[PDB]
UniProtKB/Swiss-Prot annotation:
This is GTPase HRas. The modification N-acetylmethionine is found at M1. One of its GO terms (molecular function) is protein-membrane adaptor activity. Palmitoylated by the ZDHHC9-GOLGA7 complex. A continuous cycle of de- and re-palmitoylation regulates rapid exchange between plasma membrane and Golgi. PANTHER family: RAS, DI-RAS, AND RHEB FAMILY MEMBERS OF SMALL GTPASE SUPERFAMILY. The gene is HRAS.
Length: 166
């Protein structure tokens, strides 16, 4: 079957794992559990076609810089996650997206910009700001809550469609 090599990237704590676990395991559990590197392979049906999502859940730590080049080199499309209540994570996601371009020698890499934690009241990143960033890359912006599941399928399936129609 067709495989989509998806990589979830973003600063520590933005909800990369929570999003992936909501997608794959249909649940949210509030807990502290930093990622080293986890892989999820899940056979789904998207628009009537069977495909394998191979999802790489990465670490937010800025100390794992070299291991970052390697999964960007081999990843197909990128879920670029920040949290809407964390301005620093929004500045950081710009750096991740530039790094993807450098490692992959392309500004045509399928990406979705994801503003996660949209259930929380203390928003510090306005949607329009994120929209402008995504527009400059030519990519979609989608807000998500791993807690409520709002937008989670949207974000991941939109990334798949961005690859499929690349
Ligand atoms: N309210 C709310 N909390 C969320 C959401 N997504 C994640 N969290 C919470 O935010 C914290 C960090 O989530 P986590 O998924 O571990 O983040 P991460 O980006 O994978 N971290 P790391 O880079 O260290 O692996 C956890 O307490 C988690 O429950 C969300 O959509 N809403
Ligand atoms: Ca290069
Ligand atoms: Ca598009
Ligand atoms: Mg994680
Ligand atoms: Mg181009």
């Amino acid at each position: 079957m067709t495989e989509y090599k998806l990589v979830v990237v973003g600063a520590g704590g933005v909800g990369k794992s929570a999003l992936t676990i909501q997608l794959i395991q249909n649940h949210f559990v509030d807990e502290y559990d930093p990622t080293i590197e986890d892989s999820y392979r899940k056979q789904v049906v998207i628009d009537g076609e069977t495909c394998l999502l191979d999802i790489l859940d990465t670490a937010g730590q800025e100390e794992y810089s070299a291991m970052r080049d390697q999964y960007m080199r081999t990843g197909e499309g990128f879920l670029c996650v920040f949290a809407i209540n964390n301005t620093k994570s929004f500045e950081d996601i710009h750096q991740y997206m530039e790094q993807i371009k450098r490692v992959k020698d392309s500004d045509d890499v399928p990406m979705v910009l994801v503003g996660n934690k949209c259930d929380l009241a203390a928003r510090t990143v306005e949607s329009r700001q994120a929209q402008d960033l995504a527009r400059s890359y030519g990519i979609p912006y989608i807000e998500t809550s791993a807690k409520t599941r709002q937008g989670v399928e949207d974000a991941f399936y939109t990334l798949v469609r961005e690859i499929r129609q690349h």
